[PDB]
Amino acid sequence: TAQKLVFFAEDAXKXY
Amino acid sequence: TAQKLVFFAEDAXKXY
Amino acid sequence: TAQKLVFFAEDAXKXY
Amino acid sequence: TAQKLVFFAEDAXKXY
Ligand code: NA
Ligand code: NA
Ligand code: NA
Ligand code: NA
């Protein structure tokens, strides 16, 4: 929205 | 550590 | 653009 | 390996 955020997580289990 | 996690954030302000 | 692509590279040297 | 590279791509089709 620049402001940005992303994430990714795996254990097998993700967002401008 | 597979289990994995990463993130990135920007507003301008990031982690197996 | 949904279709999304992001990348991050560090050696210390990142794109809906 | 620190040097780090990650990428994520979605169209719906991801690498220290
Ligand atoms: Na948006
Ligand atoms: Na480790
Ligand atoms: Na866009
Ligand atoms: Na390694």
Side-chain angles (χ1 to χ4, degrees), chain A residues 2-16:
Chain A
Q3 95 204 202
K4 298 179 211 292
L5 184 57
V6 298
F7 83 88
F8 306 96
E10 198 184 47
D11 187 350
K14 61 190 147 55
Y16 295 161

Side-chain angles (χ1 to χ4, degrees), chain B residues 7-8 10 14, chain C residues 7-8 10 14:
Chain B
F7 83 88
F8 306 96
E10 198 184 47
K14 61 190 147 55
Chain C
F7 83 88
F8 306 96
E10 198 184 47
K14 61 190 147 55

